[PDB]
Amino acid sequence: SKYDENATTFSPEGRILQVENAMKAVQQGMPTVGLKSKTHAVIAGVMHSPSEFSSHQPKIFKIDQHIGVAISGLTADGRGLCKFLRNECLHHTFCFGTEIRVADLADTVALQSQKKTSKVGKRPYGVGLLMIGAGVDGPRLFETCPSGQHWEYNAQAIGRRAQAAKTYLETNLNEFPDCTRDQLIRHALRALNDCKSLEAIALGVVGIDEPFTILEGPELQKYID
Amino acid sequence: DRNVNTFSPDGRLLQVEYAIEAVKLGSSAVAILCPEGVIFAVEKRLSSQLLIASSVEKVYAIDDHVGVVMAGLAADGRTMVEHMRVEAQNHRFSFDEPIGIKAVTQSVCDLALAFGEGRRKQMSRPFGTALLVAGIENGKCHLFHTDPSGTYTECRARAIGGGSEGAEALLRDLYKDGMTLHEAEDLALSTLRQVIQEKLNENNVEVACARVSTGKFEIYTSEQRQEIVARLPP
Amino acid sequence: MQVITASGAIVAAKYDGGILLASDLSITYGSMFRHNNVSHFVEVAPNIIIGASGEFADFQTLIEVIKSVILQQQCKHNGEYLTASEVHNYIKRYMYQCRSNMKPLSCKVIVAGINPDGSKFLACTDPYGASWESDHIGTGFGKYLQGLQIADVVNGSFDDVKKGITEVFRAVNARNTTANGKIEFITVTPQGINHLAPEQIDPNWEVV
Amino acid sequence: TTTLSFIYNGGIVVAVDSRATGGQFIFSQTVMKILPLAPNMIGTMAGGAADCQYWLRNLSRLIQLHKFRYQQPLTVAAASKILVNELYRYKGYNLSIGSMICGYDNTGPHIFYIDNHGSRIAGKRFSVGSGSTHAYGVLDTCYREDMTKEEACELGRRAIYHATYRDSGSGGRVSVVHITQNGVEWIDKTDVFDMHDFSKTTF
Amino acid sequence: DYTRSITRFSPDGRLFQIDHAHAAVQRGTTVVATRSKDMIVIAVEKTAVAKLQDPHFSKICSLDKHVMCAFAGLHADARRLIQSGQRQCQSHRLTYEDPISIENIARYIATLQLKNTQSGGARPYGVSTLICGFDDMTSQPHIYETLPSGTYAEWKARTIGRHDQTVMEYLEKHYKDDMTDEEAQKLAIGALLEVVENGSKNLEVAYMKRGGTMEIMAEEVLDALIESTK
Amino acid sequence: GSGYDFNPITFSPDGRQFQVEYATKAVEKDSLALGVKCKDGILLAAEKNLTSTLLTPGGNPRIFWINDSIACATIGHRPDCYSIVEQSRNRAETFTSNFGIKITVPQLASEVSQQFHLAHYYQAYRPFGCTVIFASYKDDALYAIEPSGAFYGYFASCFGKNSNLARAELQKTEWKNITVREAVPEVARIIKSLHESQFKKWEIEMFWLCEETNGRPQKVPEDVFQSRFV
Amino acid sequence: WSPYEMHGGTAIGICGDDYVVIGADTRLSVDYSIDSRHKARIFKMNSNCMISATGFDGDIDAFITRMRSILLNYENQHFHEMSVESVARCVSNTLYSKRFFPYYINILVGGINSEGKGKLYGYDPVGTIEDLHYDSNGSGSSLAAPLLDSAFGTIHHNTRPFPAVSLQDAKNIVRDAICSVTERDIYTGDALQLCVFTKDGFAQEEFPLPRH
Amino acid sequence: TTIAAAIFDGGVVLGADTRATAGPIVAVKDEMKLHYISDNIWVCGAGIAADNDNINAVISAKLRLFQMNTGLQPRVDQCTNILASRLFQYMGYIQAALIVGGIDFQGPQVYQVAPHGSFSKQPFIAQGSGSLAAISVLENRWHNKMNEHDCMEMVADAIYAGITNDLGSGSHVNLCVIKRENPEDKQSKVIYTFYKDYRVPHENDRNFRLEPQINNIDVEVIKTTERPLT
Amino acid sequence: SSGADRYLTVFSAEGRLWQVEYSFKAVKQAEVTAVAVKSKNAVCVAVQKKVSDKLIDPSTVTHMYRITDNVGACLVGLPSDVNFIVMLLRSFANNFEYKQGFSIPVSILAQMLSERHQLESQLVYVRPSAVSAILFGLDGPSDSFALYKIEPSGYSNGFRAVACGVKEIEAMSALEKKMEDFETPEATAEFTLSTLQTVCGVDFEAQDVEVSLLTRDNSKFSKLPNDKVNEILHAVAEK
Numbered sequence A: 001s002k003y004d005e006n007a008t009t010f011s012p013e014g015r016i017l018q019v020e021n022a023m024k025a026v027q028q029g030m031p032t033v034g035l036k037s038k039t040h041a042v043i044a045g046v047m048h049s050p051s052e053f054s055s056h057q058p059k060i061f062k063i064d065q066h067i068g069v070a071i072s073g074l075t076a077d078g079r080g081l082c083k084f085l086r087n088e089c090l091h092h093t094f095c096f097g098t099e100i101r102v103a104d105l106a107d108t109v110a111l112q113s114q115k116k117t118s119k120v121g122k123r124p125y126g127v128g129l130l131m132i133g134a135g136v137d138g139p140r141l142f143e144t145c146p147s148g149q150h151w152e153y154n155a156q157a158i159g160r161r162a163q164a165a166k167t168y169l170e171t172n173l174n175e176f177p178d179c180t181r182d183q184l185i186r187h188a189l190r191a192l193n194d195c196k197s198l199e200a201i202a203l204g205v206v207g208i209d210e211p212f213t214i215l216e217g218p219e220l221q222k223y224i225d
Numbered sequence B: 001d002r003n004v005n006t007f008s009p010d011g012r013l014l015q016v017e018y019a020i021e022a023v024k025l026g027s028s029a030v031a032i033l034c035p036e037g038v039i040f041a042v043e044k045r046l047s048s049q050l051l052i053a054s055s056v057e058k059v060y061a062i063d064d065h066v067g068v069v070m071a072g073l074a075a076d077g078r079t080m081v082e083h084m085r086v087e088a089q090n091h092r093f094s095f096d097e098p099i100g101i102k103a104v105t106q107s108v109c110d111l112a113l114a115f116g117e118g119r120r121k122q123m124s125r126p127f128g129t130a131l132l133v134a135g136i137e138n139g140k141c142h143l144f145h146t147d148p149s150g151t152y153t154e155c156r157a158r159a160i161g162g163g164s165e166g167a168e169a170l171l172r173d174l175y176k177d178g179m180t181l182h183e184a185e186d187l188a189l190s191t192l193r194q195v196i197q198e199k200l201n202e203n204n205v206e207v208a209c210a211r212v213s214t215g216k217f218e219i220y221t222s223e224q225r226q227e228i229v230a231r232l233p234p
Numbered sequence C: 001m002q003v004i005t006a007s008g009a010i011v012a013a014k015y016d017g018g019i020l021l022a023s024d025l026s027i028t029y030g031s032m033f034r035h036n037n038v039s040h041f042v043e044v045a046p047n048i049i050i051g052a053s054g055e056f057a058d059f060q061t062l063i064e065v066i067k068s069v070i071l072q073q074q075c076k077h078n079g080e081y082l083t084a085s086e087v088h089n090y091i092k093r094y095m096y097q098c099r100s101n102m103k104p105l106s107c108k109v110i111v112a113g114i115n116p117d118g119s120k121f122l123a124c125t126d127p128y129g130a131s132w133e134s135d136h137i138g139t140g141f142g143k144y145l146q147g148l149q150i151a152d153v154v155n156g157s158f159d160d161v162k163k164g165i166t167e168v169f170r171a172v173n174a175r176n177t178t179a180n181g182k183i184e185f186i187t188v189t190p191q192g193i194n195h196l197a198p199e200q201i202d203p204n205w206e207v208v
Numbered sequence D: 001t002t003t004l005s006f007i008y009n010g011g012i013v014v015a016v017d018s019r020a021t022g023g024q025f026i027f028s029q030t031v032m033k034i035l036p037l038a039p040n041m042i043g044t045m046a047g048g049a050a051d052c053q054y055w056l057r058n059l060s061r062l063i064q065l066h067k068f069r070y071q072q073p074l075t076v077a078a079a080s081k082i083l084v085n086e087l088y089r090y091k092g093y094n095l096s097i098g099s100m101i102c103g104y105d106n107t108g109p110h111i112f113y114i115d116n117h118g119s120r121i122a123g124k125r126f127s128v129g130s131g132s133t134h135a136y137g138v139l140d141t142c143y144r145e146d147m148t149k150e151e152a153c154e155l156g157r158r159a160i161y162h163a164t165y166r167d168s169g170s171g172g173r174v175s176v177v178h179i180t181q182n183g184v185e186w187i188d189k190t191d192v193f194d195m196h197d198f199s200k201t202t203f
Numbered sequence E: 001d002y003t004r005s006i007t008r009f010s011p012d013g014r015l016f017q018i019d020h021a022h023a024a025v026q027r028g029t030t031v032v033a034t035r036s037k038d039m040i041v042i043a044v045e046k047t048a049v050a051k052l053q054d055p056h057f058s059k060i061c062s063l064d065k066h067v068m069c070a071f072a073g074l075h076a077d078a079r080r081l082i083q084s085g086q087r088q089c090q091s092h093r094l095t096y097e098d099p100i101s102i103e104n105i106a107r108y109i110a111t112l113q114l115k116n117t118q119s120g121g122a123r124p125y126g127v128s129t130l131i132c133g134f135d136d137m138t139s140q141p142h143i144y145e146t147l148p149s150g151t152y153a154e155w156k157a158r159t160i161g162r163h164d165q166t167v168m169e170y171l172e173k174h175y176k177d178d179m180t181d182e183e184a185q186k187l188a189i190g191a192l193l194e195v196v197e198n199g200s201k202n203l204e205v206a207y208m209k210r211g212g213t214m215e216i217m218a219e220e221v222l223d224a225l226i227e228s229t230k
Numbered sequence F: 001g002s003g004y005d006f007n008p009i010t011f012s013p014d015g016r017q018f019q020v021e022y023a024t025k026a027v028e029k030d031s032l033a034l035g036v037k038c039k040d041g042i043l044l045a046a047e048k049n050l051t052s053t054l055l056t057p058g059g060n061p062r063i064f065w066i067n068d069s070i071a072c073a074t075i076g077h078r079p080d081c082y083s084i085v086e087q088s089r090n091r092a093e094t095f096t097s098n099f100g101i102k103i104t105v106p107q108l109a110s111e112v113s114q115q116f117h118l119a120h121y122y123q124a125y126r127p128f129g130c131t132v133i134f135a136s137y138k139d140d141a142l143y144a145i146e147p148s149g150a151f152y153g154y155f156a157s158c159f160g161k162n163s164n165l166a167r168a169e170l171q172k173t174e175w176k177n178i179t180v181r182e183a184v185p186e187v188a189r190i191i192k193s194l195h196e197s198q199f200k201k202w203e204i205e206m207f208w209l210c211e212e213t214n215g216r217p218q219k220v221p222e223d224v225f226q227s228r229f230v
Numbered sequence G: 001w002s003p004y005e006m007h008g009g010t011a012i013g014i015c016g017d018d019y020v021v022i023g024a025d026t027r028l029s030v031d032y033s034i035d036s037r038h039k040a041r042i043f044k045m046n047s048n049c050m051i052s053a054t055g056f057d058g059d060i061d062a063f064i065t066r067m068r069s070i071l072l073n074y075e076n077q078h079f080h081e082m083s084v085e086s087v088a089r090c091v092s093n094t095l096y097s098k099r100f101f102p103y104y105i106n107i108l109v110g111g112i113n114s115e116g117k118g119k120l121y122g123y124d125p126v127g128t129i130e131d132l133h134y135d136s137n138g139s140g141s142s143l144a145a146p147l148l149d150s151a152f153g154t155i156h157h158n159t160r161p162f163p164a165v166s167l168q169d170a171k172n173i174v175r176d177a178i179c180s181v182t183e184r185d186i187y188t189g190d191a192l193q194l195c196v197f198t199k200d201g202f203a204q205e206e207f208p209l210p211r212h
Numbered sequence H: 001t002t003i004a005a006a007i008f009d010g011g012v013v014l015g016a017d018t019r020a021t022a023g024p025i026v027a028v029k030d031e032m033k034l035h036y037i038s039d040n041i042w043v044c045g046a047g048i049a050a051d052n053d054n055i056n057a058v059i060s061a062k063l064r065l066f067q068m069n070t071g072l073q074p075r076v077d078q079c080t081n082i083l084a085s086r087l088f089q090y091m092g093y094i095q096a097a098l099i100v101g102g103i104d105f106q107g108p109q110v111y112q113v114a115p116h117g118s119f120s121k122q123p124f125i126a127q128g129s130g131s132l133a134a135i136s137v138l139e140n141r142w143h144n145k146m147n148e149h150d151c152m153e154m155v156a157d158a159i160y161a162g163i164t165n166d167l168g169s170g171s172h173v174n175l176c177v178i179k180r181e182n183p184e185d186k187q188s189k190v191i192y193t194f195y196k197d198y199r200v201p202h203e204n205d206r207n208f209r210l211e212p213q214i215n216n217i218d219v220e221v222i223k224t225t226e227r228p229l230t
Numbered sequence I: 001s002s003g004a005d006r007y008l009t010v011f012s013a014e015g016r017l018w019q020v021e022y023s024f025k026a027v028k029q030a031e032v033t034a035v036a037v038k039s040k041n042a043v044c045v046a047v048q049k050k051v052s053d054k055l056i057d058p059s060t061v062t063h064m065y066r067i068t069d070n071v072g073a074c075l076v077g078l079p080s081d082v083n084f085i086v087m088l089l090r091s092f093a094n095n096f097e098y099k100q101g102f103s104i105p106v107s108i109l110a111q112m113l114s115e116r117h118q119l120e121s122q123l124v125y126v127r128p129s130a131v132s133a134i135l136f137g138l139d140g141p142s143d144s145f146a147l148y149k150i151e152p153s154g155y156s157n158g159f160r161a162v163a164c165g166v167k168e169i170e171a172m173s174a175l176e177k178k179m180e181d182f183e184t185p186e187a188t189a190e191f192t193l194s195t196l197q198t199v200c201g202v203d204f205e206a207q208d209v210e211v212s213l214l215t216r217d218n219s220k221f222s223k224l225p226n227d228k229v230n231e232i233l234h235a236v237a238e239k
């Protein structure tokens, strides 16, 4: 409590309490789920509707043609990170002319978040990103943390009620590598359904040859069964 | 804590939540979207009759097609609407088209959370203003809500300010997706009148319509505000 | 833009098995034959060779840049090299950046490599930054003293492409002042980069 | 290029050729040399085409920004001043802007000759361009204050036509604009080929 | 440079630094700006040692030949505001050749105060300013009140500083919709006198007539108007 | 206890750098990673206690490339771990730009310990809660930089939880007497003996820099040693 | 030192009622030497427009990369692909951003607008924009422009309506004009890249031309 | 200009003419071209008089600050390195062709420093317009370990050769003999003896002058005023 | 602003720089003692080389560093601060050689390190670098040996004999109570190692101490190989 002053302050236990507060800010975001097959990767999430007549706040974003990120936490910080990631993809498609690897984007966003947590006067991004990419590296899923680190996953859940989604993913973890695009999307939607408190769920799906695309609302009806 | 960009143990930006509270201390404003247009009805707080009402305008025309109503700190809202106007004219200059409502909303939101402290030379605190951005894009009226946190959401109906929660509760069973612009104006003014502490009058209210038929965000004159307040059931 | 310590002509041509690049191993100081056994090509990746005709100082600076960037992306990718297309794109963007800064690298840079998909990639970036991918690229007098000797055999058998490049470099040795010494041949194939033995490509001297 | 603008009792008539030509080749004959700035203000384009188009659309952006920031619209003097200050900040960069800011504001008709060099000259009759001397000759010889709208528009049209005839840099179609209190009116684009009288044997 | 975000939100949603700047304003001398169809009048009460100091240090300033400016609060923060406002009037003339709109210059002063509320390492101006003047582009005299928060509002008659609520009540009671210039003078003078127990020797009254510059009321005409009001 | 533990640059009255000590605590919390110099090369082995079974098998690296001859095992705060990895890559690139040759692990460790030390030497920085073991066979160097910025060459280095027992076990073997391929089973046995039962699923992310790799960093192939355990 | 290579090559754009036919010679060449016999100079910017750049190839590649970057940014920040008119304005502003270090490239932005109508925009290196029914750029611009003027009469009579030339007829006109330019302009040659933007999208054809 | 410094057995003899020309006209006939740097170092400079004077003053200040802070005798190679670096960083625009002549622990050292920053340790050096006429004497009369008087005469004769043969050189020969106060004691204090007007060529003096000065110009005074000097 | 006098390097109510004294104690935390003795013919600096764990490569556990060929530095303090000081003294030396054109004297290097420690003791955003530095070498201009100590406070002095580390007080006392104008480099080395051994109260081996003995012959800095260190230790164990 007394050491929860800055992101630059270590608590006597080695913990950065402001970093942990930002991580909790991510854990307070709406349920986000990511999956990874040998051919496709999926990010889905129950978008948040602050008001009854307000639309669901977009949660899935397309960083590059085969890269997308699902934000969980401060959506403004998520948009800032999306801007940064799109700049990184545009400078990798400028310097090298090809699409960056989602692993490199995870590295860059982790570096930026760590620099936010290592210099005073900066706050960790209050948003965690489930980034799915596809390329020469294959489909890859990364959960980037406010602390400045990204964890590579075959599946993952973050935000609120994400323990049920994590349990579902653990149960079906060995199914995912062979799951087709349609089956991976179905698994994503059925991991989110366990988190239900659809027109709220937005799902970005990418493949090795399939460019990243965002499906929302009725477009996902075919993947419920 | 003690620094602006600090997260509570609950995972909230304390300055952001306090700016949300500041918005809750601002004048009420109801934005009702209907297929014909988006209608703002705003409580103009007049501490005296000597206060020129037109000068405490809580409604700002960002561009011909897009407008904005503030709730909270009028000066922070002035900064936000200035940024939005510059963004709209820059977009017209760069792409020869009106800026999308979502686009300008996202730009001002990106501006909103860029506050910082402790680093050598930027704003030092979040904007204590929530905007109801609305306008006509591609023959469609779009209504967006920005709050100090920098998050924006598209809204069919929204309320910002002191009566925001009560106004939303009243809108629960009063708002429908197919209302006419007449009905949208009536609902906005009724909700505002219900969530203000003074009798509604053309002088203490500011009404503005992003009208699809005209494709433009206009601000209603005293005559139009009277034309709406007359129709109200009270 | 000024060339002083210049690398001679380069002729690269795709054949069935890969890309065959030839160039003398001599750097000329103005007109002087100053340095011998100096390869004009640098293996920047196991399947990516980079040569340049023109100022060799600007090609050593470009190779420093290329190797640094390949090392960056290799550390990022845990050993995986940039592709020939990516390396040439970086060279195109860095040489255009140099031209835009008014300090152009006065070397026409041939990037010859096998992309991981197995498609031969031969591209060239001129000092100004204008880049182009082609099945055969001549730089220096290898571009001028070429004719149809490469174009007729390009993408053909290794023997035919080798003979065409040998004809072009016989013309170069005959009619290029800066052409000095053996003509090194480098085969960039999907099986790696092989430096074939340098060959003295003698002009027909029964002319006298 | 040849652009002209004159203030008569009925408003501001702005007539412009449509030829863009560099050296000898005519790159275009349909160039629009009148760019609107405000509902009752336009800016003519002469000299560098890219410079005039970029800076007149930038001035339009600035005028719109000022009108939205402050309810009072940006006047023609203020708009021409903005443009001339921006252009003067680029003195020595070889910009080529010749541009008559012709508009009707709260103080009436206003034509301001704006140049890259930073000159901002108020006047009731201007002509900018290679053939501007010919348009000036026709105007100053045939201009009256009490011309009808049709008469003033035809005066501007014929001055641009004579400039196009006598100048290789001017040609295409005369875009005629009438600016009145009510707002900018685009009269017509008249092909100077049709304006030429081929029954005459002198020219 | 120093960026300590002096102005931050409190849990209740208030910028305590803005409250303190308002307190600084409310300890400043009373200012009363009133307008007529053609003339604006500003009356600032002056606290001074008449026998030992020059009363020529005025709270009323002239940002431009058409922009009159008075202030309540810290005299140094007000001097900075007035200096920046004069610079902005001249810069608006440089950029447009037109006299800066009274709304424009009032918005600029309010935006200066707002930037001090937003810029890290910057103390909000402890000054509330009455930016008055005439616009030819609108044919309307204007009187805007810019606050330390950075909010500016046009008023028919506004007062700032100490006793601002009493003078506001006086203005509300004795305001006429279509006052003459002398009626505006009488309203401003009487409103200031309601809290001041001294005549011309204390009050300072300036005015700006339609298409005119700022003229400071004499110590003879001011006293005559004071007696007429009483 | 006392207030000397908030500012990294502050010294405790005993000369202790409490923030540096807390960064070291962050290192000690993490699962142990170690490195051993062997006849044929240097072997870096990082224990990855997989928090979730959903983590990619073989993903989430703790050993990183720094140069085509330098690898970097990382212990402690993983954000700081990869920050130091990227700063080491940048330092190697800058060293090549300035000097043309490829950096050596001793002077790379010195250059990165410079950043480690700057973190707790100048205010406005957080000490890196990470220990980085740079290994290079081509430099026959195994230099571990600690959160303070203290860097030492080791015959066998290890940091993290149970690092003292891991070092005690590494002490039992003359690692230079053996090659990397026969060192892998020994290090794996060490970590498995010290692996805590609470972590069911986990992995041994082994890398080596050897003649078999031509001195290039390379993850120990799965066939040689399946890194994944249950 | 001039930072441009003054590469030759012609691009002929023709806007139609519902199509845009830009045909540009592939050849990259300057100073009697052909750097690349094939070097495409018409690029599909998005599903709404294509840009055809003739001139310095370094500046062609740089400007096309910048335009792709800006269109990707517009798609990300404004949530739809940049329209042909928006791309045209962006091309004008992008070229003018380098007004003092101009991209020595002449641009034809051809696309299909929201109305479904063809929209061709011609440019100079410094960013002059012009909504055109047809345009010609590059080394053979002077050669090709009379060809289009004869085919349409727009230069002869400016104010008359632009003739309703069919898509295939416009493609044939561009082919014939490019072949005439190739016959006369040395820089124009090798292969013609005949790109067509229609409601059906971006179509591309490769026609041989005299190499000599 | 003719400046020439040589190294004799016991020290250094620097010499310079005293003629500063403002083009083809002799502006100064007693110009000081030998600039005191430190007690042990003197620089005689050619080129631009302002550049020489200022750079010598600046380097003298640098070495005086050095000797003060560090208590160390300035080194001739140190002064030469500072001068050469400064002249190189100005890319030869400071047209100060200098000859540093001093005695440090390394003994008597004479360095040339070209305006572009190219320095060189040489036993005898001549710079300036008459540098060739001087160097001839220096070439013919300098030998290893010559005594003080012979080097004085040689350097004076080289400056005189520049004076007579070169138009840019003339008037007197100023010398400066850097030497150890006890030549037999290599550790003794390095003192300098400046011989102003060491040579005053009698054939180069004003040999005629009108004793009754003939003048037919009459001064008509428009206005006179006298003002006190305080 | 009160309360920063103990956490930042600002003077306390009693006028002390508490952070400076705490940097002195951090130097004490090095668990190592250095003793340097200067004589007309040589300067010998012996610093105990305590390797806590033998898994560490001892060649990297060094408190003696080459600043220049002629100037060595025996730095006792926090190892991170010691490495920062070796890099900052080498930077000082390189900048001095680039500007002045000759290798930095020990006196000037000590002055520059003192200036840095004064910027640390004044700039409140800079930690006082907890390194007691023994700079030593043969100054050419005087052709005589220089031996300076710069404390974390920046308090720099020239010493005939100096000591740093845990036994700094006791080592300095023994040095002053037994200092002599030695007539040989090996007598200087013997006195250095004898004082260090006595104050550390433990018998030394070459493995357990880094010794640099810069003589008029070997003026250039170099840590003595274990052979010479063992020879000096045996000479010190004779009496």
Ligand SMILES: *C(=O)[C@]1([C@@H](O)[C@@H]2C=CCCC2)NC(=O)[C@@H]2CCO[C@@]21C
Pocket: H001, H002, H019, H020, H021, H022, H031, H032, H033, H045, H046, H047, H048, H049, H050, H052, H128, H129, H168, H169
């Ligand atoms: C000498 O080189 C000379 C003198 O003015 C000289 C300059 C440096 C030291 C002070 C006096 N420089 C000149 O410009 C003239 C031209 C001939 O040489 C000069 C006399």
